[PDB]
């Protein structure tokens, strides 16, 4: 059973947000 704190959850949410931004940016650059 994996256990995390609140700070790991915050960091993982921020990493997901950043990953979505980089996915959009890579899509924009590849399209152009």
């Amino acid at each position: 059973g994996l256990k995390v704190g609140p700070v790991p959850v915050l960091v993982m949410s921020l990493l997901f947000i950043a990953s979505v931004f980089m996915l959009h940016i890579w899509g924009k650059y590849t399209r152009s």
Binding site: G1, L2, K3, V4, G5, P6, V9, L10, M12, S13, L14, F16, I17, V20, F21, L23, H24, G27
Partner: protein, 435 residues
Amino acid sequence: IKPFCVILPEIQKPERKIQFKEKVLWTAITLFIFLVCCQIPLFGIMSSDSADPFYWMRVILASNRGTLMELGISPIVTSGLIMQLLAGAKRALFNGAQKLFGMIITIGQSIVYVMTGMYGDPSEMGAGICLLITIQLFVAGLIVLLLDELLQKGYGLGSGISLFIATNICETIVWKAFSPTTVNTGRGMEFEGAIIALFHLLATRVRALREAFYRQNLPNLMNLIATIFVFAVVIYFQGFRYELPIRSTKVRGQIGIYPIKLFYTSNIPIILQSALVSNLYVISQMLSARFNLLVSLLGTWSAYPVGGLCYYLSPPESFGSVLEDPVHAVVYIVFMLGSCAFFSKTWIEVSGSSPRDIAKQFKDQGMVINGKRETSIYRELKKIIPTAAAFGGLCIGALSVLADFLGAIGSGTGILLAVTIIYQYFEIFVKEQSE
């Protein structure tokens, strides 16, 4: 299924207690994370011009079309209902299974959303972009579950559902009030926020005041006044309570007061009514759009209804609608009040707040009503609690229809949800302050 249930992230319980200030800070951090996640558009979306099939689910689920939080609080509600049914039909394994079923229903709902017809044409997207959107919504639902667990294990004041719903409604109201978005259709730059529009019109140009008050195509200042009035009225009616003078018998020296609030079920009637009506709306839209006289009776969708059961459930669009169709307004008001009363009276027996359950709680803890015997404790509760619940539901429905008729900002259901959830957070504030 044990390995499958245990292969899931979980938040460590705070063995050491957390002060109220840190709980508030973590609640604010979770709120900020959800707010950022509900404004980030999804990747791979081809088009967002079609009508929203689940537009009526947005307020109740605290969602935003096209963003990561488009499913919203759906995983939490679905998992909770699924395991409530499972428990009815027959310890951390329970939480693990709840998380697993929430993820499964999140995958299913994401598949339905992608295949619904929005995001452009799924066939043109291909199995790649659709799968990528499914992964994004899966991770968003996992984040929602993690944030709800963060708020419920002890790091946060309230639950995730209530906080997210209240935050979405409050953000919608404040945006409609102060949005700096400019919209023009041949009449100059008209600001989309009512107060900012008032300032802009006063600076640019009496006529400005009347335009800012009766601006039909945009948020009004009269609508803001109605919203403030509904806030005040709902707060005043939420302050209503019945204080039962009680003592202790099992152990002496404990004195206290037992309040039976008028809004005995705080927002559960609103949540149940909104979920039922919005589900009916979604089913009616999908059924009429896809492909019968009975379907027409379920509602002649045209997007607002122009006939049918869903029309009779819909609030009147204007005073002219009531004038031309008084029967529709009467049926709508009657259904609101009756559904609220019936849902509250059902919930007080389902959620273990029945007069019998409260009497058993009094008897086990050794609580006795002052001036009344121990045997007749249930009788006074039988006199008070059922009427309290029924009239609380009826008053909630009356406030909702009053706010809808006044054209309040954020809808009557939204305003009632916001006020009730904020009052729950206020009573949490006072509880943690006194403790």
